[model samples]
Target: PANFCPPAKVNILAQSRPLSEWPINLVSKGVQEYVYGLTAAEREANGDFGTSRKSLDRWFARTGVPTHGYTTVQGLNLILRHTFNRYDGVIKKVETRNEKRRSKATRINVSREADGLPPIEAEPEETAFGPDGKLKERPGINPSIYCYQQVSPVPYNPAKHPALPFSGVDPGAPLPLGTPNRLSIPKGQPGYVPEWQRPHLSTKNKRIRKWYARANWRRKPGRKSVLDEAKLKEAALKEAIPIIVTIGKDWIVMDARGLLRAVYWRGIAKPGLSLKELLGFFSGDPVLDPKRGIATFTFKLGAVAVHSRKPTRGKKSKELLLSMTAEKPHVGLVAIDLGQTNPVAAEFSRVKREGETLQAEPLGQIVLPDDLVKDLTRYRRAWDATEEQIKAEAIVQLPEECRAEVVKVNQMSAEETGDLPWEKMTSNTTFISDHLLAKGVTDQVFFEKKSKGKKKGTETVKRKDYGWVKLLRPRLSQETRKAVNDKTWELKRASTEYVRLSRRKTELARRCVNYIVRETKRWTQCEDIAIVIEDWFIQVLHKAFSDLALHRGLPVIEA
Candidate 1:
């Protein structure tokens, strides 16, 4: 029998040196400087300048820092590896951009020839410097140094290095090979105090300090909160280097200093498990929240990523390890029709065969709870409302420069509006407005306000607001702009409500999916089953049901 298991990543919490040290900074600087030093011609070339371990060693030796004694060849090796990767990445970008630009130029030439106009001679080349006389880096490439620093995996023998720390390793223990002890402040260094010890912050207090410490790390300059995308990216990039030892039931992690923490997978602590080519990385920051009177100069290890095997290796290896295997065949089909009208319509169907005929014998339609139906309805309403509110808000806040084009497009008939360069149109609001008009959604209304007539106090006239378009065009009057402002206010409140409700509805919908799958499993009696879904019903149901099916080891098929 064969069983395939994907590689598992177990986190190890250990304390070590802060990454902001001079040595760490120096390494980061050196890597970037090497890239910056490359000439334009050299950068254009695909060959590595000096990224090898020996080359890095020689380069650092000239700067009077021996790699063997300081951080060693491995650190330099890993750093250079990433540098070359980045360099190659940049080169790819250059090639891709140049090719795209050349193709674009070719297209322009063809278009010009068709129009009987003179074609340009060459494709526009990307300039090295901006108009401000400052160097311009290639787009889609970040200038910041990556934080991943890898360490060679070490094998652990429970008898020898038996003492494992769930909390952290001993501060006085020997550091890992080629790793400098930069955790503690040294004597004679600036900011060092005589007879000063790191504050003994409590375990609970340490956790709190860590929370704020991570927040501060992610905090961008001139912003109180980090953007969701930037936060995700930074957290991934700031991932710590995992130095782990394995083949002893589970694995042990190592930081700059020796023997950080170990994960004992089995209940008992013994050394019998096997691990091939294990990789480890530990990431953390110093827990120093002065506001809370906590300063653990030592870096608190938070998370570590360990890579052991490829995705397919487990499957192939399992087959190789075991000579024979058996699979449980699916007994019955559970067809689930995900509909907008009813959310989900599931039925257990059994195959019947007689002579030469096969037919589906459906037991009964599975009925969902009333609460789930309500949630699905709510989710749909909120989802639609959120989109509508956002669109309404955007239309009321159209750009001033695009106002005339928008007004012109809005007034034009479908055929006239379609005659404009729809593909070349850049403004989102203008495009949306025009597209909506083309679809014959002419009832698209603007905010209206009552303004004083020519005979002021005698009568009032209702005027349509074209948002920002009417503001500068005084002929439209100020009352129209006030109506647009009022629309914005109304849309803002509605948008916020819809957005919050949509999020809650989505959560409830997810829970409902889980509940449906749970009920299906119970009905099927834990037997292998196939889920049949209708095509073009609900897009989310594909992922939702498929994910739930995958979790329960069932197969999902589209009808």
Candidate 2:
């Protein structure tokens, strides 16, 4: 295309030489002249964008094809198609409308018969006296005794409609973020939940659903019967066309297209499903990390587009030159989705292991919050709403003020127990009352420097750095002690005997803190160490785990 030959101009006065017919001497001159002419005219270029001297000159130099008389002729035809081939395509008359627009051009069509045999024809003019010199009645249709086949609109059932791509919609708008594979939730509607509050879930669950995620398509018919449209226009203008001289006293009642348009309005039908609405749905179940006290989930995005009608070809002669060029959205719907999927349960759930297979164990069923009955109820409502609803609040941990006393665990760890799981616990709490014998363990008493009032008239500080401490006592049985130290003891959600047992484990935790504080007062006499005792729980647990790893004799988690 950049460098090519110009076809010989076919006008009169040129010799009747078809390159082959031309004598060898004149053929070169004519071809050169055509190339030069196009250059001067600044047409499709001087043969291949002004590179013709080298491109076309080579054509004359080398002969092509082994069969007789073919070198230049092949090049000649290729160039000819480039120039004079303007007939693109034509439209065929597949429909009756394609052929006879002549009669149908009336603003709206008036049927010959109504309700089978003709009923009363509506009055064409109001307040008019006919030649009989009597006033005419307004138009009316008498009761019908039968039914007639109604003509449905054309383009009603399309042979095909074009698929338009979405323009305004951004494909990359909401990408995976924060956490990997997390999709952005769209604005407006049922809504989104924070990642942690929801149970953990995988990202693969991304899907199209009956939500406001994608664009939908449906349209009511436009522009009813033709004749009524004409009349409506006449009403818009002051004068009716061609014959407004004798205006009707009242109005004309052709009711042509209105005859078609009016039926649809009264009937319960929608134009199409296009309106603003809330769009939201769940992705997948949240994965819960009870020990870490957090949750994670993967998110996904949905795609949308716009659609419309336009002409691709123009008319030529009597032909309606419709184009096969196809239609698409230039700038379209930047949209949302859904379907009537009655069920796909538990997209969000806690999957547990059963033998080799993992079975879903809905956490709500097992994790009863004996202490937090109110919060548990509130959470159930939130969970019912696809993780998102529950996110309005966070999972609650036991309050420190309510926690009970516990024994010192530092000396009780099991170095004989092998590497233990990060978190392990007995399914139920060991009731303090079950042990019943409350001979309390390690209590502490301490005192800082104080002044003895009026001692020796000089405010002398007598009892300086005075403190008292009880030797810490171990309270758990060897089995319970090992279990607690290694985090191998599971706390039950509730005790069958009580409604909720919120504080057993944490109280035991606090008990360890108090006892440790007592021990530090006994030896180091440091308040700094007492304050930081709570922060050492992890280190204590870590040490307990190391002891468990080293001590194979430590207790194992029950199945």
Candidate 3:
């Protein structure tokens, strides 16, 4: 009985949607279903919500809709979550009252059964969420979270776009030492680096990765280990596959739910038992699709500790599930400069393994192209707000179809918050509460409490004045709580252009830039011009390009 049972709503139902919109259901719901294929690649390409983004590009092209569909999990989740919130609002608006008022309605479940009997006008359950619901009442999701507008299928102009807030990874570059000193990550093992995912990785970090992989291949009894296994895994956690959670809130929480959902014993055992617990078993070691936008994670068996009681088994102890998840990313929400990506099925079938060796076919993945995934760090040597702003648009805070409501009752006298009982005076204490001053605050529901001898009790909880919420609700955050009796607070709910980046990786990437630069020189240069300029020779080029030159003889210096 504790086993997982797919929610009964698994089957796609055209009957479940508005009859007037045919393509709407397919585009909105059915597409999500099709992409929820039992594979990490599909989910990773489509979304955490199991959207088939790449596949949908074809569908949209055929259907005349724009092709750049919601590719990241965050994008699709935001769209779906917002629509659901709006739909729920419409239904509640109708189910509210029976008083014959203008344009007011309610879904009171009543209809005639007998041939002659008038429909019994029994009222509906009279609520938004029904009997015994556990889901907390939430504020409206900011409609502005949709990054759909910046879709430049026209093209992402690298020179024109601004630099992203992601790591300094140039996909066009090669590994350190140009493959001569580089080590290969054994297939099915965890050690490949996706430099773009770690925006914060610094160059001078003492941690040695490549050297450790080479030195620890044998994992001999007594040798200095270069890589910290625990620390390396922890780094992946920060670069953890990003998915959208609680869309009704701000900043995508770093949860691996979507990745787990797409790949854990998929097509059979299910993400056995608890989703959160199942995800904890992974170390999220990754592999880089050096030529694409994809940053795929690999299997790290036994990397995480887990329960053995009826423990979820994959193909074998050594036969790890072929792969876990894949990610597609974007930097759409400009307010927080939040970077995001889609995580999907990497492999559902466990590959062959002999003790610690892999001898099976790997999942074929191609992520982003060279142009879109450039390392704009070079541009910082020549960057500024004015020039960068010329190509990119300013992202301003705007209001969306956000909602607000009084959450609960707060009976207090403003002096203290949390625990309070005012006006119920006793012979044991001082004044119950000082008179509350309601200045800029309004929305107060005044009431009365009972006390001996005293006429009664005064009751009121006023809404609080928050610096940000008094304006239009934006996608920047959760709604400001509104209570007539002043204790509730609220807020305005509310990206980038360098191809607008996905800054998931850590400081290690930017840290390794020196190595990439050194290698670039090794391969692309040879015996050439003998012009070794000193440190202060930087301004030498300035004179060559100067506009105020009088003649070629003015100040020509010999090379």
Clash numbers, per candidate: 8, 42, 54
User: Per-residue lDDT of 1-559 in model 2, one digit per residue for the tens?
Assistant: 1121111111111112232332222333344333322222232323242224455445444422122232344334333233222111111222233435434432123343433444343323222334553223222211111101121111111122122111111222321112232335533422344667457654463332222212221232663423344444334232111100001111111111121122123232222211111001111222222223222221112211112112112232112111110121110110000011210011112222233332333212111124433443443453345333222222122233311222224323332111213135422222221232133232223332334345733321221211211112333244443333332122222223122223332333343333333443333322222011011123332233223212222111111
Each model's lDDT comes to: 0.45, 0.25, 0.29
RMSD of 1: 17.5
**Which tens-of-lDDT digit does each residue in 314-391 have in candidate 1?**
344334212211233224557666764677777876444432233456666686789877766767775776667665
* Pairs that collide, model 1: 240-282, 240-283, 241-281, 241-282, 242-280, 242-281, 242-282, 243-280
Error of 2 at 429 (Å): 38
Candidate 1: residue 520 lDDT (0-100): 63
Compute each candidate's TM-score over C-alphas.
Answer: 0.40, 0.12, 0.18
Ordered by TM-score, highest first, the candidates read: 1, 3, 2
**Could you tell me the lDDT of residue 373 within candidate 3?**
31
Whichever of 2 and 3 has more lDDT, that candidate is 3
Q: How far off is residue 232 in model 1, in Å? A: 26
lDDT of 3 by residue, 1-559 (tens): 1222121101110122222232222344433333322233332343322246654355445434332333444345545455444444544664554343322322222223334445444443444343433222333322122223222111112343333222221223321121231234544545554555456555562334432343454466776555567654454343322321121111112233334443442432232343333333333222212123232333234332221212112343122122211111110000000112311111111123344344443223222223323433333323344334432322111122322221211111122221125434333232222222223343323322323236553322332222112222323333442222122111111023222222312222332322322332333232110111111112322232121112111111121
Find the candidate with the highest TM-score and give its number: 1
